[PDB]
Amino acid sequence: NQVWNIARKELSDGLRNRWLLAISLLFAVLAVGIAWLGAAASSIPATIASLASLATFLMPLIALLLAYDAIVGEDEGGTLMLLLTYPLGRGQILLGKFVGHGLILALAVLIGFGCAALAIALLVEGVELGMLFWAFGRFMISSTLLGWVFLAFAYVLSGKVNEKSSAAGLALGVWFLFVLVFDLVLLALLVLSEGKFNPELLPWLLLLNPTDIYRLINLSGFEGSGSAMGVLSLGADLPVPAAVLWLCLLAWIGVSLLLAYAIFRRR
């Protein structure tokens, strides 16, 4: 298939990016350090809520470092106009780049949370290996999906711009807005209104931020204190179940990939 033949390039081109391997080893040496400090103090719902915030700062960062120069980095490099004269479509050299860069994030978090589990089973004596594999299996198949959202965000902001220096400004803008501005605008809206703006609409704004849907998935079982959540304490007021919370994260991929294809179709 032609979708895999261009995936084998990006799987072998993203792994030679030295800026990726720096901040993907930084994700590995921090997920062990949080889990080592989480083992000497004991707690259990605090070491889950800190890993999900660690992958909130880094799995959008590795996704936006990969794919900000996916379309416009090939357009000004000349190799995009050449590629359309190969037997391909615009839907195959985009979905092929998404599978190729998606297996890197599926491997960058399998390295990160993989050694984090071995720094718990060899550190916390008497831990439940069934509960460890299930909780960190929920961390593995949902930090990819958070990564695949910001991968699909970067294909939107690469097809729209026409210069790679302006694509790096927008990719830094998307990383600042979704990670640590939308969590602070919702915080500043709740303090200044003292929770009396809307008592039923305000938990639904967590679903308009995929990092907040990511944090709500992993903190489903390990609730604990309220300040362990903080802004995520609104998620107990959401009447939606857990299975739809998986489905709105998959729907955040498919809308922002169909937007990435409809932009690229009129490039």
Binding site: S12, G77, T79, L84, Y86
Partner: protein
């Protein structure tokens, strides 16, 4: 009959940036599109590749549609400037393009030696010069026996030993039966290797045909200079009897601007009377013909 463009008048933005070009290309000729870097030449280049839609007209590449995958395996496109993938190597870039075009994987090792790049194989494209990337850009164009090359300035940033060797590699493929289109702007020198030029300007294809037709359909002076003549003062007059202005700049530097309508009697004028030293018969080059037709269009 490789490229049969007929009646295409491309409109976009209701501007009509190309108009009614009838560009039939034979099955062994080397055509040259010689417009500016504006919407005349590069619009018709995108039509043959199939990545543009010909409004009000039909483009038939190799007897089929221009965007079919069965004919797009038989094309080869060398673009203008391709800094390909700076972190990939040389072999892995060409093996990537070999997997896409359906070419056999044994062709990459015999194309990195056919083009002079086996010393720089398994080396990263960030460590390549501009000429080495044009060598790599040619290597994906000859991939899997292409019946239609389309080179858009292949000899920029290249040494003249490689430039003379590239046109011999072009002349190997011309005898094999592959039609080549040379969209270029380094027009002195390319006239020895092309078969038919196609000067298009302001959308309208002004002149097409071989170099003998473009000199026949445009009266241009042959530039005979006879440095080292015996007598020059009557030779100011002995050429202008048939309308050839004997203009000189030294003791004997008589650069006779002729008319190319009296070629029998002017060489007999030179060799019948007066002894020369170093004759230089300069035919009207591709710059002067292009400066006539573009000036005739405006």
């Amino acid at each position: 009959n490789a490229v049969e463009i007929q009646g295409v008048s491309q409109r976009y933005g209701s501007m009509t940036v190309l108009h009614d070009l009838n560009l039939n290309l034979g099955e062994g000729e080397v055509l040259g599109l010689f417009g500016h870097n504006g919407a005349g030449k590069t619009t018709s280049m995108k039509l043959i590749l199939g990545l543009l839609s010909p409004s009000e007209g039909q483009v038939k590449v190799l007897g089929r549609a221009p965007n079919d995958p069965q004919v797009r395996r038989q094309l080869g496109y060398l673009p203008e400037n391709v800094t390909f993938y700076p972190q990939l190597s040389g072999r892995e870039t060409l093996r990537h393009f070999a997997r896409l075009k359906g070419a056999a994987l044994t062709q990459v090792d015999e194309l990195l030696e056919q083009v002079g790049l086996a010393h720089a194989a398994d080396r990263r494209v960030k460590t390549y010069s501009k000429g080495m990337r044009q060598r790599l850009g040619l290597a994906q164009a000859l991939l899997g026996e292409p019946r239609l090359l389309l080179l858009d300035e292949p000899t920029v940033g290249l040494d003249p030993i490689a430039t003379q060797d590239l046109y011999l590699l072009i002349d190997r493929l011309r005898q094999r039966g592959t039609s080549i289109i040379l969209c270029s702007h380094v027009l002195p020198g390319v006239e020895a290797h092309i078969n038919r030029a196609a000067i298009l300007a302001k959308g309208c294809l002004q002149a097409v045909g071989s170099l003998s037709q473009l000199r026949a359909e445009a009266g241009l002076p042959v530039r005979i200079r006879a440095s080292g003549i015996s007598e020059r003062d009557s030779w100011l007059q002995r050429w202008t009897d048939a309308g050839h202005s004997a203009r000189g700049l030294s003791e004997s530097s008589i650069e006779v601007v002729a008319v190319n309508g009296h070629k029998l009697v002017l060489l007999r004028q030179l060799l019948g009377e007066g002894e020369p030293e170093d004759i230089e018969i300069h035919q009207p080059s591709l710059e002067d013909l292009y400066r006539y037709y573009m000036e005739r269009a405006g």
